[PDB]
Structure formats: C-alpha cells, structure tokens
C-alpha cells in the first residue's frame, strides 16, 4: 500500500505486571486455546491482522485495541495473566474487533462465530 505499516503487536510479556498460574488459566491454554487453535477456521486469527498484506489500510483506523489468538497464546505460555477473566476478555476483544470491522454474513464473521461458539462451549466447563 506504499509506506503502509502495521502497528507493533500487543505485548506478550511485562516483567512489572503481576502474574499467576491458576487452574483456570491452565485450562484456558490446555483446553480452550488448543481447541480453537486447531479449528478449520482458526487461521485468520492465529496472528495479528496484517493490514499491509491483506491491503486493509483502514483496519487500524477502526480497530484501536487489536487482539488475536497468536497474542493470547504467547500470553498464556508466558504466564502474562493474573486471572482467567483477563484472558477471556482478550478473546472477546478479538471477536468484537472482527464483528466491528466486517459485516454480518462475511466469511470472516462466520469463521469468528464458529470459533466463538466453540469458545463458549469450552468456557462453560471452566473449573472454579
């Protein structure tokens, strides 16, 4: 797109941020992320949106809090989180961003919805 760049991606480590490894965060990585990561429709969400490559120069004009499963995975692996709610919120940021940027019925929106369906099935069974 010519001098077009992507923002730097979200941090996946912060040494001055309080961290914990809860039973619920282990399940988020072990169940909820391994499940969605393997899914047939995961691929658009496994890394930050490459707006340069995909030729989407308004992406990061509309989406100011980007999130993707690549980011979430690295955060879960690097024990970035204090609790499972922080993580679940990143998942919801990723789905909402997609629904914001795109329009109902778009292939991408069907992919996100399939993944979100699956997300929620798995999160129902989050151990206390």
């Amino acid at each position: 797109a010519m001098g077009s760049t992507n923002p730097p991606p979200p941090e996946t480590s912060n040494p001055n941020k309080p961290k914990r490894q809860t039973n619920q965060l282990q399940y988020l990585l072990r169940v909820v992320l391994k499940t969605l990561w393997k899914h047939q429709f995961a691929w658009p969400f496994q890394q930050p949106v490459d707006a340069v490559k995909l030729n989407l120069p308004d992406y990061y004009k509309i989406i100011k809090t980007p999130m993707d499963m690549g980011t979430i995975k690295k955060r879960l692996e690097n024990n970035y989180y204090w609790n499972a709610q922080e993580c679940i919120q990143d998942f919801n940021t990723m789905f909402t961003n997609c629904y914001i940027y795109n329009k109902p019925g778009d292939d991408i929106v069907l992919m996100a919805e399939a993944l979100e369906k699956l997300f929620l099935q798995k999160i129902n069974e989050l151990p206390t």
Partner: peptide, 4 residues
C-alpha cells in the same frame, strides 16, 4: 470476494 473481500474483507474491505
């Protein structure tokens, strides 16, 4: 097709 297209994402915009």
């Amino acid at each position: 097709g297209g994402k915009a």
